[PDB]
Amino acid sequence: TIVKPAGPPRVGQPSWNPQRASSMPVNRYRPFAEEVEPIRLRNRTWPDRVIDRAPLWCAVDLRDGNQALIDPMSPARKRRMFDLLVRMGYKEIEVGFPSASQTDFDFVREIIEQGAIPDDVTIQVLTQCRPELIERTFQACSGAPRAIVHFYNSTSILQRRVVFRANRAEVQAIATDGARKCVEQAAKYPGTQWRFEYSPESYTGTELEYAKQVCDAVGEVIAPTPERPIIFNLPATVEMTTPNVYADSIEWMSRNLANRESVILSLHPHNDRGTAVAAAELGFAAGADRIEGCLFGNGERTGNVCLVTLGLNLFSRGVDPQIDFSNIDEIRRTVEYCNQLPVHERHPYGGDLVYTAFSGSHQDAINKGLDAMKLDADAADCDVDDMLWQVPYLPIDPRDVGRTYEAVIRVNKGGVAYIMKTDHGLSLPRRLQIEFSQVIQKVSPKEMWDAFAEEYLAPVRPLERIRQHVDAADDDGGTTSITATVKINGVETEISGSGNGPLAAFVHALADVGFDVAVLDYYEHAMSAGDDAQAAAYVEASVTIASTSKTVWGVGIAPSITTASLRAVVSAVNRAA
Amino acid sequence: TIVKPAGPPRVGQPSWNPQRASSMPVNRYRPFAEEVEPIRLRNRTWPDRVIDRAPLWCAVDLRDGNQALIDPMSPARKRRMFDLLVRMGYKEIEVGFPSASQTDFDFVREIIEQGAIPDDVTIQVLTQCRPELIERTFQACSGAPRAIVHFYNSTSILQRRVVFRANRAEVQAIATDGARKCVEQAAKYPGTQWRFEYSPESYTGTELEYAKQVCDAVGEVIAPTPERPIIFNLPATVEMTTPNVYADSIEWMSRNLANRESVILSLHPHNDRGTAVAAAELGFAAGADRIEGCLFGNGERTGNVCLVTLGLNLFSRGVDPQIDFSNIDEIRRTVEYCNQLPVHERHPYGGDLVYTAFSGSHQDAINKGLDAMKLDADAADCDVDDMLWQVPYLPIDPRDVGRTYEAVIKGGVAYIMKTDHGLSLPRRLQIEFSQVIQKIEVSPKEMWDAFAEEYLAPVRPLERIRQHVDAADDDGGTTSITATVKINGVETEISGSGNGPLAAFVHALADVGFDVAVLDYYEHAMSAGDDAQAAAYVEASVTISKTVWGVGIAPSITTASLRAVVSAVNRAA
Ligand SMILES: CC(C)C(=O)C(=O)O
Ligand SMILES: CC(C)C(=O)C(=O)O
Ligand SMILES: [Cl-]
Ligand SMILES: [Zn+2]
Ligand SMILES: [Zn+2]
């Protein structure tokens, strides 16, 4: 059960703080400086540096992400993730651990043999240091034009004592023997341009002076140069303390590593304290060159640092991340298919709720921000979508990541979608729900329905549809023509058009009477099932009217699927007025 | 869709970095120093401080959390969250926005009238500065033994310009008139120990000198003392930049605010950049006294800072958070029930997978760690459960929060069919098809071949060659159809009437021995444009009774629907 803390307050605790000591066993845990070492970088510069360039990114979704899954990726899921990363713009991708996993070996073989690797992309493979594993790693990459061989071994104080029971020389030799084998194997495969990355695994549990010693010894074996640099990757394998301390450690390593001009300094933070993004950002300001992570923070336990958050955290402060996030929903859907794990509702940039506003005062402030941008754009003769984003409560324009701001209205088990379906049998398409909620913004079930009817169902001006004759060709792929009687602002008139179906025909007919309806989307569903059966149709259109253009939804309801579609078009035109 | 970045690399971009410029509109966004101001702090000290005591916590789950939910808390869920917060050890709890919401007003009344507030807990209520709203707030707290009245107004450069259209003096007067009204109402409600909190809302988009001026001016009205302090709560209403810059802001405020001994400096970070936890911790090292957050990071958009993460981040480094997390599963189950939102699988400390090791190598190292602990413990006559935790890959003993270490040893139909073929299958069709596919992993290319072979290709027993639709002109009139079909290869005419073309065609099929009833029907466009293709999905009961899906694809809404009926009839057989 949960036990209310009841111990004494600390000595010195202010009288305005009535908190009590808990009975958690805090004595089983020590401050970082005692667990590992004191890191004091008094002359640090990272606090005074603002990031002004994207780092070199490396995506490790196919390895660190993959092996953290409940269900590891099938061959199809691996290819889909790899193609997604390539398409987004990543140029270094860790594709697996091929010497430890036959499925990973076969994946690396498949991408090499089927020419799936672009010429500006370098695949990365992880291996432990045992000589036969290193050999198998090189075998896996046979025929690659280029590849990064990432070898690692654990250097932490704790692992040296309880896992390896070894001294400093012994654990360093594991790494330098690995490096020696890498040099020897690279000489055997002259057809591939080999590059190396070494990680002192569990770096954040390792003395910095020892980390430097091991990395330097590995570097002497590899003998990197400015034109062929080595990657030293410094993982927060477990995130052990606050991100400022990790940043201090990176700045120290960046200053003190030998042959620094021949080093690409790489960060690999995990999220055990929930501050992986902060560790990466402050560490990059501290002199790192490269960051390893996963899309949406997948990876061992709490995950690797989120590459989406890091990239969009640049974008939103005016630095190009050099990765495309223009359609974050596509990225999300692909990630969820590949990982079989959802992106949380509140995940930065991608989560369901992150461009939502529930508060009336927030919604009002957002509309004022939006209105003022449009006014300044009209004045300067510019597209508002190209102007400086100046909107309270929305860090970015959701349209810049392919999303839409959502002003959610509460209905007095609730919510517009749910009640529309239960009370009126309509399944509103998601973008319709958002549009309609914005109409309501500018509520009881009755009020909701009444607003829906006056907006989408009732209007009869400027366009009313009386009747029509549909002449559909009998044969597949044939033309449908329509003649319709309509009232335009009260006045009966006859219109004509043709199209691949009655919807298209009707749309084309209305163009001659001054309504340009460019159909963007369309959905239909049944309501009920017999002689009482009806169809509900929803049409999204960019509409322009004679005597500017607006994207709007129309709704139509009718016993015929054809007539419901036509009613929806009329509904859209009248919304646009 | 996603387009690979293809613009020129930056000048001076290193040879070893081949990344290209994206086409994202970065020029719509400015560095923080330009959007707001540069950092004013000389000789910061927060980078040299390690937290060594717990802050004063305030939980805003019942307000910031609650108002951010799609399903807001019932009165029962509210009491449950309140009691949870009390039992865990929280002493300040923001219980609502009662002047804006009758449900919050009724809840405040309820916990006061029922005598539900322990002697060491102070409730906190949120209000805007309008005088009528302050009155209503005090009415809600009538009879409270003590209460924090938290009043706020927005101070940021942006909101001053485009929300309020007001200058600095006017915006300061709103806060300061608010404070005066609070002082007035406090004198009219005797006995209650009134306490105040002021937030310059959107603080992170506000000039620091100005934020200081407003707070100082509010404080002059309230006249707090060291025994009766005021809370100045400085929110990252939007998280706008890196946590070090927030922390520099906090340290600056802590050093420059007037009457500092009579101020509890409070942080209220949101998570827009994923760094609220970091902002809080560095902010606390910067000299803040107090932190407002929600359990498991609930709240507007990306949420308020996570109280669980902050508290257990102290525990795991040897500092008592003064809050009990001994049973994090109870905490989580209650939070999930109250918020009706899940804790993510990877959420620090509480998520499903955070104490799981799938890697054989990690499992081995974990076991070596636990064994050496058991050796040191047998040798010292101690329980291992009281010994220093020393286990690779596990920052804490999962038992210390009621959990356990777990050494652990789905075709994607919807996604593949929508992504590769433009088809959004109705949920029940997804199920039907993905069981037919388990029976054959199947590649995407293999999956499509099977979809086509079941839904699109068959032409027996029913093939539809062509048809004439005679649609009623007027609404509500009849539609007739005449179609040329083949039954088991045999050309035959069928004909029928109904309320639309789809009904007419199903009734027509009755004459030929197929009794079809439309149970469900869905249709969607397959591209943009006033001409593109339609996908239709029909679920029908079909005798010569099996209930089956059909799929039709065609340039016309009408024809796609008819093909979907044919598809269904052929699956039935
Ligand atoms: C293999 C190494 C880089 C690792 O994943 C880690 O230390 O987290
Ligand atoms: C009311 C204020 C403190 C708020 O919730 C915020 O600024 O985030
Ligand atoms: Cl019909
Ligand atoms: Zn890792
Ligand atoms: Zn807030």
Swiss-Prot record, chain A:
This is 2-isopropylmalate synthase. NCBIfam families: leuA_yeast, PRK03739.1. In M.tuberculosis this gene has a variable number tandem repeat (VNTR); in CDC 1551 / Oshkosh there are 2 repeats, other strains can have up to 6 repeats. Keywords: Amino-acid biosynthesis, Branched-chain amino acid biosynthesis, Cytoplasm, Leucine biosynthesis, Magnesium, Metal-binding, Repeat, Transferase. Residues 55-329 form the Pyruvate carboxyltransferase domain. Homodimer. It is found in: Cytoplasm. Signal peptide: none annotated. SUPFAM superfamilies: 2-isopropylmalate synthase LeuA, allosteric (dimerisation) domain, Aldolase, post-HMGL domain-like. Its cofactor is Mg(2+). GO terms for molecular function: 2-isopropylmalate synthase activity; acetyl-CoA C-acetyltransferase activity; magnesium ion binding. GO terms for biological process: L-leucine biosynthetic process. HAMAP family: LeuA_type2. It comes from Mycobacterium tuberculosis (strain CDC 1551 / Oshkosh). Its EC number is 2.3.3.13. PANTHER family: 2-ISOPROPYLMALATE SYNTHASE (PTHR46911:SF1), PTHR46911. GO terms for cellular component: cytoplasm. Residues 14-23 have a biased composition (Polar residues). Mg(2+) binds at D64, H268, H270, N304. CDD domains: DRE_TIM_LeuA. It comes from the Bacteria. Belongs to the alpha-IPM synthase/homocitrate synthase family. LeuA type 2 subfamily. It catalyses: 3-methyl-2-oxobutanoate + acetyl-CoA + H2O = (2S)-2-isopropylmalate + CoA + H(+). Catalyzes the condensation of the acetyl group of acetyl-CoA with 3-methyl-2-oxobutanoate (2-ketoisovalerate) to form 3-carboxy-3-hydroxy-4-methylpentanoate (2-isopropylmalate). The lineage of its organism: Bacteria, Bacillati, Actinomycetota, Actinomycetes, Mycobacteriales.
